[PDB]
From a paper:
One such TUT family member, Cid1 from Schizosaccharomyces pombe, is a now well-characterized TUT, which was first demonstrated to be localized to the cytoplasm and to possess poly(A) polymerase activity in vitro, but more recently has been shown to possess TUT or poly(U) polymerase activity, in vitro and in vivo. Cid1 has been extensively characterized both structurally and biochemically, revealing that a single histidine (H336) in the nucleotide recognition motif (NRM) is predominantly responsible for discriminating uracil over other bases via a mechanism that was proposed to involve two alternative conformations of the H336 side chain.
The structure determined to 1.74 Å contains two molecules in the asymmetric unit with one chain exhibiting a typical Apo conformation and the other having a significantly different conformation. In one of the molecules in the asymmetric unit of our high resolution structure (chain A), presented here, we observe that indeed H336 adopts two conformations via a 180° rotation about the χ2 bond. Therefore, the H336 flipping previously reported, which was inferred by analysis of the refined structure, has now been observed directly and can be explained by the hydrogen bonding network with D330 and several water molecules. Of the two molecules in the asymmetric unit of the high resolution crystal structure described in this paper, it was clear from the excellent quality unbiased electron density that the NTD of chain B had adopted an unusual conformation. This conformation is related to one seen in our previous report but the mutant enzyme used for this study is trapped in an intermediate stage compared to the previous closed form. Dyndom analysis indicates a pivot point for the domain motion of this ‘intermediate’ structure as residues 163–172, supporting the idea that there is an inherent flexibility within the enzyme between the two domains and that there is a single hinge point about which it occurs. We analysed the volume of the catalytic cleft of Cid1 and its intermediate closed conformer using 3V, and found that in a native open conformation the catalytic cleft volume accessible by solvent is 3339Å3 whereas the NTD rotation reduces the volume of the catalytic cleft by approximately a factor of 10 (336 Å3).
Numbering used by the authors: 40 to 148, 152 to 307, 321 to 379
């Protein structure tokens, strides 16, 4: 049970994870942008966040960067100077000024036409979200391949499109973490936000505090295989999770929170996933009725495949490209 599925899981993981060549290319891109920035403003710094930073990136990943500056200095000149410099160094793309905040979206140039890099300014909340995810990936070796396999599945099944009514990759990562912390028994992970060792840390009006002294955390008491974990994850969201009523949350000791209790009955609450630090944000706000239908449909198809009576089980079907 799951030994063969586990073998398959790791094989796929090693095929879909970002290659050493691509990683050093992305690192080389980051070093260039940091150079460009250093000449515009020595005191500022360029921080990477998201998948590339936390080690949860698939092949051909895009970049997500953040520029940090003192709050007294009006960004306008620095962000636009940086954009001008990047255009001069061969990148192409957009500068967007929207609601008093600037964003850079680079689209071309290694690094080629393959290049897609989003640059924000003083997006500290995203940095802290990534720090939490990075911490969990350091705590247990099973998490990185589990996340990559789920992201790969969601992309292949066309349920990873927040603009077409389904769910962001970050959403799926939080669904995985919720399952590993609050559903599976024994837990794979403790809840680092609710730990007695957690200290309040207020950043931009939110508490981003969590227990980050990972060295002192004992080994997981869950000894199940990657295959077993995945099998469990698909079954939970296929059958047990009740999206009409319940909220995926990192703020309850037992993981129990209803939409009514939360007060989450164009932001949708069809699928409700409470962001662990920015708790007023529903990461699932992009999911529509038809989108949830397809997401639930694919969880059931995945779970049914993994429990097939027919041998041998066509495990490759799990990552088979869906129509539409």
């Amino acid at each position: 049970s799951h030994k063969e599925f586990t073998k398959f899981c790791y094989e796929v993981y090693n095929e879909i994870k970002i290659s050493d060549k691509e990683f050093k290319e992305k690192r080389a891109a980051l070093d260039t942008l940091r150079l460009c920035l250093k000449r515009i403003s020595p005191d500022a710094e360029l921080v990477a966040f998201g998948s590339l930073e936390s080690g949860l990136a698939l092949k051909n990943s895009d970049m997500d960067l953040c520029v940090l500056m003192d709050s007294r200095v009006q960004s306008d000149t620095i962000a636009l100077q940086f954009y001008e410099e990047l255009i001069a160094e061969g990148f192409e793309g957009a500068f967007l000024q929207a609601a008093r905040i600037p964003i850079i979206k680079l689209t071309s140039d290694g690094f080629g036409a393959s290049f897609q890099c989003d640059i924000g300014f003083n997006n500290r909340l995203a940095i802290h979200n990534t720090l939490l995810l990075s911490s969990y990936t350091k705590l247990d070796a099973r998490l990185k391949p589990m996340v990559l396999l789920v992201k790969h599945w969601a992309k292949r099944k066309q349920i990873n499109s927040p603009y077409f009514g389904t769910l962001s990759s970050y959403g799926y990562v939080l669904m995985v973490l919720y399952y590993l912390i609050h559903v599976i028994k024994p837990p794979v992970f403790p809840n680092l936000l609710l730990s007695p060792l957690k200290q309040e840390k207020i950043v931009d009006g939110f508490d981003v505090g969590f227990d980050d002294k990972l060295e002192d955390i004992p080994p997981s008491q869950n000894y199940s295989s990657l295959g077993s974990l995945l099998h469990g994850f698909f079954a939970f969201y296929a059958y047990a999770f009740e999206p009409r009523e319940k909220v995926v949350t990192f703020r309850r000791p037992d993981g129990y929170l209803t939409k009514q209790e939360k007060g989450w009955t164009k932001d949708r609450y069809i699928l409700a996933i409470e962001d662990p630090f920015e708790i007023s944000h529903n990461v699932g706000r992009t999911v529509s009725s038809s989108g949830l239908y397809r997401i639930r449909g694919e969880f059931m198809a995945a779970s049914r495949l993994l429990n097939s009576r027919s041998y041998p089980i066509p495990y490759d079907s799990l990552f088979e490209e869906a129509p539409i």
